[PDB]
Write an enzyme that holds these catalytic residues in place. Sequence first.
Site, PDB file in Angstrom:
ATOM      1  CG  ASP A 334      -2.028   1.047   1.047  1.00  0.00           C
ATOM      2  OD1 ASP A 334      -2.979   0.870   0.263  1.00  0.00           O
ATOM      3  OD2 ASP A 334      -1.877   2.091   1.715  1.00  0.00           O
ATOM      4  CE1 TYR A 465      -4.495   7.768   0.454  1.00  0.00           C
ATOM      5  CE2 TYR A 465      -4.265   7.570   2.833  1.00  0.00           C
ATOM      6  CZ  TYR A 465      -4.483   6.993   1.602  1.00  0.00           C
ATOM      7  OH  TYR A 465      -4.692   5.628   1.506  1.00  0.00           O
ATOM      8  CG  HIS A 523      -5.981  -3.170   0.267  1.00  0.00           C
ATOM      9  ND1 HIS A 523      -5.095  -2.594  -0.619  1.00  0.00           N
ATOM     10  CD2 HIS A 523      -5.671  -2.676   1.488  1.00  0.00           C
ATOM     11  CE1 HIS A 523      -4.312  -1.755   0.035  1.00  0.00           C
ATOM     12  NE2 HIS A 523      -4.640  -1.787   1.314  1.00  0.00           N
TER      13      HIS A 523
HETATM   14  O1  4A0 Z   1      -3.806   5.689  -1.477  1.00  0.00           O
HETATM   15  C1  4A0 Z   1      -2.641   5.019  -1.793  1.00  0.00           C
HETATM   16  C2  4A0 Z   1      -1.469   5.737  -1.823  1.00  0.00           C
HETATM   17  C3  4A0 Z   1      -0.308   5.072  -2.147  1.00  0.00           C
HETATM   18  C4  4A0 Z   1      -0.341   3.723  -2.421  1.00  0.00           C
HETATM   19  C5  4A0 Z   1      -1.515   3.019  -2.391  1.00  0.00           C
HETATM   20  C6  4A0 Z   1      -2.683   3.667  -2.081  1.00  0.00           C
HETATM   21  C7  4A0 Z   1      -3.961   2.898  -2.042  1.00  0.00           C
HETATM   22  N1  4A0 Z   1      -4.505   3.130  -0.730  1.00  0.00           N
HETATM   23  C8  4A0 Z   1      -5.460   2.100  -0.418  1.00  0.00           C
HETATM   24  C9  4A0 Z   1      -5.719   2.326   1.063  1.00  0.00           C
HETATM   25  C10 4A0 Z   1      -7.133   2.121   1.548  1.00  0.00           C
HETATM   26  C11 4A0 Z   1      -7.827   3.454   1.417  1.00  0.00           C
HETATM   27  C12 4A0 Z   1      -9.261   3.307   1.910  1.00  0.00           C
HETATM   28  C13 4A0 Z   1      -9.250   2.937   3.390  1.00  0.00           C
HETATM   29  C14 4A0 Z   1      -8.560   1.608   3.565  1.00  0.00           C
HETATM   30  C15 4A0 Z   1      -9.346   0.563   2.793  1.00  0.00           C
HETATM   31  C16 4A0 Z   1      -9.289   0.895   1.306  1.00  0.00           C
HETATM   32  C17 4A0 Z   1      -9.984   2.227   1.100  1.00  0.00           C
HETATM   33  C18 4A0 Z   1      -7.846   1.002   0.800  1.00  0.00           C
HETATM   34  C19 4A0 Z   1      -7.140   1.718   3.014  1.00  0.00           C
END
Ligand code: 4A0
Lengths: 546, 546
Positions: A334, A465, A523
């Site tokens: 991630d 972010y 994920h």
């Molecule tokens: O944003 C980035 C930045 C860099 C790399 C990968 C990502 C991808 N991020 C996925 C993270 C995530 C965001 C949201 C809350 C929780 C469950 C899902 C929805 C996935 C964690």
Amino acid sequence: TLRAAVFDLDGVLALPAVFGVLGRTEEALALPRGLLNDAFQKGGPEGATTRLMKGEITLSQWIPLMEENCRKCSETAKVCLPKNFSIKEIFDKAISARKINRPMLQAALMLRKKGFTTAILTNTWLDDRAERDGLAQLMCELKMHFDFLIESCQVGMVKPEPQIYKFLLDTLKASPSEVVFLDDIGANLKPARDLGMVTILVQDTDTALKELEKVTGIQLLNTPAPLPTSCNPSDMSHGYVTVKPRVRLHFVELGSGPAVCLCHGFPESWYSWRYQIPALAQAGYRVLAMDMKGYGESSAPPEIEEYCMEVLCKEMVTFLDKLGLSQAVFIGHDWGGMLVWYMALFYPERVRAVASLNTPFIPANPNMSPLESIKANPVFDYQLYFQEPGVAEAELEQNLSRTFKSLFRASDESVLSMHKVCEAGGLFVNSPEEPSLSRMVTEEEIQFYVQQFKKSGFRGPLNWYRNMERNWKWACKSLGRKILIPALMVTAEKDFVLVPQMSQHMEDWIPHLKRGHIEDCGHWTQMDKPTEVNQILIKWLDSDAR
Amino acid sequence: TLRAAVFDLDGVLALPAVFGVLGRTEEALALPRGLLNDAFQKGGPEGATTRLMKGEITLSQWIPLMEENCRKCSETAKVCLPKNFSIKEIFDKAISARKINRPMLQAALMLRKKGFTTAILTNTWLDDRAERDGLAQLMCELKMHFDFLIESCQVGMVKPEPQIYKFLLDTLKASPSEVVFLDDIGANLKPARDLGMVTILVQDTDTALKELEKVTGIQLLNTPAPLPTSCNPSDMSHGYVTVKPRVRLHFVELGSGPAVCLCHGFPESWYSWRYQIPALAQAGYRVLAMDMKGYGESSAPPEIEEYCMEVLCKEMVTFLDKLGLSQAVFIGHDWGGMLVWYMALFYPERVRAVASLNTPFIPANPNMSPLESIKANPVFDYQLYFQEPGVAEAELEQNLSRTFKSLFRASDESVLSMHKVCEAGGLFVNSPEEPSLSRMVTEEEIQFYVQQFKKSGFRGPLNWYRNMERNWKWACKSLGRKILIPALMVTAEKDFVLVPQMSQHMEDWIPHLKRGHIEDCGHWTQMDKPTEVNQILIKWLDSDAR
Ligand SMILES: Oc1ccccc1CNCC[C@]12C[C@H]3C[C@H](C[C@H](C3)C1)C2
Ligand SMILES: Oc1ccccc1CNCC[C@]12C[C@H]3C[C@H](C[C@H](C3)C1)C2
Ligand SMILES: [Mg+2]
Ligand SMILES: [Mg+2]
């Protein structure tokens, strides 16, 4: 009734038994059947071997004494020992050929899981051979799974002397009828039976486990493939490095070998790597699993700029500096995955090899601001919601249990749609107050995360972010380069945000890129399919990083 | 007036310069004088090399571009480049042949010691070669000694562009007339002179330092041999392992390579190893310097039995277990020295090699109680004084500053006689309230110890002396054995308690024992003669433990 299980090492938890080298050497060298066993046993309770097993003498002290016994035995059987005949040799070879009997360990594990006290009771020796580390390694791999390890040469007693069984009972705090004891040597069972212990004579593994299955009433054979070994947080070495005045980085550390640095995603923790940490130490690597800036026991300054990648990266480099590490393997998932690709691009001298799970490497688009870019992919709607300092903290910090129980779910378990998060007004707007537990995590594992985030909440994690423009300006500096250091990309079929296709262009920037792919994997790669992840990382490490 | 010193890397802090491979390769291969330098410089501010120095492209991206330039240059000089001509080759060899110019580092060190801000400003490149770790290592060994390291390829500018000198000034927070800048290339000096910096053109090292000596007014050439690099406590990685419910072990950790575990004496600290820790990491080892049970940030339960060696040892083994280390090298001093010999004797599978400073290995006498034994050597009178719980704590905890300032002294500096301590009523009965500072320690180094002992005082440290009978019973178990693993003994001419002659029988128990001997060296081996100790340990490690 039964509450404790005791396993011998040789012939029971490790195979082949080293006695079975005395047998095979005899055949292999065409000597009198049993000649070597007699010399091994020469003198009974007062001969060279018993003093060895009692810790009176070291292995290297014994080797010549056994030699003399083999001479006596051949003189009276009127045969010649061959030329270049070597007990050091026979024993070196035997000792390095013994491996863990996996099905036996697995049964021990299972009974420990259903509440048995498990112990290894073994006649062993003080090993001072040049090649002793091999046995040191096996014993480490074995003992971590048991409540006790009782070694003849440490306690000064040996099987089958009755006193060691008394020592055993006293260690287990158990009465003899509460104990199953397995051995491959019948004489060693004898005194356990006298006290009224359940005993099992281990000839072939499968039959011993069937007897063990029946007597404990616990299914041990044919059982589902178990998870990899996990980490108990308070059994880890915890390490802390101040990379600069307001900022300390915490990590957990296991193993020796080339340094391998694990970088978790949003909103996770070193603990996300619990299933990889043992297996990679085991596969010969020095695992440093981080709390990344903002989480857990790592520092979490408030300021947004503290979390642009340029600073996160410089900081990871300083972390190598202060640990005295010239390089490490960086493996990320991630957010951690995004960060490691930038480590490759900006500090390739520090990265031995780079690996990411889910996160593709994607270059900056120098024509298009990344906020604008982001609106081009509805699935990234949540990233806009994260922009306004305060908003997302408040939803996420409101109920921590609900938060992780909601986020950490398998691909077929999802309770939230990433669709129109800003419109709806939150990530959890249409999900339960009390979500069911995912099949991937226990109640306790959720609570550890909960406790972690009680230290600093979601301000620091969210800040990652919040430097889109600043990261884009910095990424643009890297547009001339390619990643030419060894590099692995692992896609997850069913990550619906970081879809496999997102990575399809990576070969334009990383031409020697290796790949692996996990099916039916959401994920949360590391806990969703820990086994498969371990195998892909260890195979790649052995080939590209060793 | 002058307050900052700036050093280039190539030709100034590291020799030979890699430009001087373009020169030598040309001769060595009988090509047109200057052909390679021209190709290197092809295109000036827009050619392949400048984009390399600016971080636009990685080294491996540049290699072929330089290749093409060498082709152009030879076509117009109407010569043939030889067969098997290889820029990767020429550059690999050049880059691994560059070493730190020791006298130049030493001068940088000295000026930093008298208060200068020191910086490295270098035109370098993003190194993604298969062999890049070599340069990663040199840069680590160099940067730790300077306030700043400014790399062309990180900041996107290069010498001699005027903007990098502006970047430099702004980093130093200094005006140009407060700065001396040394370079081997005159063009690079040019813009520093324009701003009014003192500049030095470095041809031979000695002449550059003489100019540096004159302009700073600081003696830099011909200076006394300096101490080894020391540790700044708050720049260390600090590690913590819970070996059991009431007991955590702290250590400081530096370096990669085989694990080397340093065990300090009574009444010391991991800090006693400050002079060895850098040098052994540097020599390719993973240094784990402990706080031993009872000290510093390690746990210190009250109970006497918590400090018999059987328990101290089992505990050190558990520490390996939880760190995932199958073996380590154990090196001890004073009490730590006694303990490591017992680690060799009771867990040779866990010890890769064993080393002690001062402390001989001496077997238990199974005929004579060790309290009785102790009265046979007047010099051990202090060990009887330590028996009665409370007595020695109160003297030692009374004035901590006085305590360490009294104890930590060179052989010719001693302010207390070990004679008739019980009779007199204390260790410090006839010594000053305010002792002078030893030549061996600074005021600050005393205060760090002082602060350490404020956590738990002297109860735990003293308990080590309070299990004589119990340790003797346990040692007696080892009377049949010999230490056959590699092992070094280092005697100190002028330790008047642990005299060299005390060790004269050790070859009876450890037949392949290696020795080293330090002259004019008191009891505090590690800080008394740090240089000599480093050389003896590194030479032995390279030969017996690698
Ligand atoms: O944003 C980035 C930045 C860099 C790399 C990968 C990502 C991808 N991020 C996925 C993270 C995530 C965001 C949201 C809350 C929780 C469950 C899902 C929805 C996935 C964690
Ligand atoms: O006792 C042991 C036990 C084991 C190994 C070595 C020794 C030797 N111990 C010397 C320790 C010492 C005691 C006393 C106070 C302070 C200054 C000197 C006088 C030396 C430290
Ligand atoms: Mg057996
Ligand atoms: Mg130069």
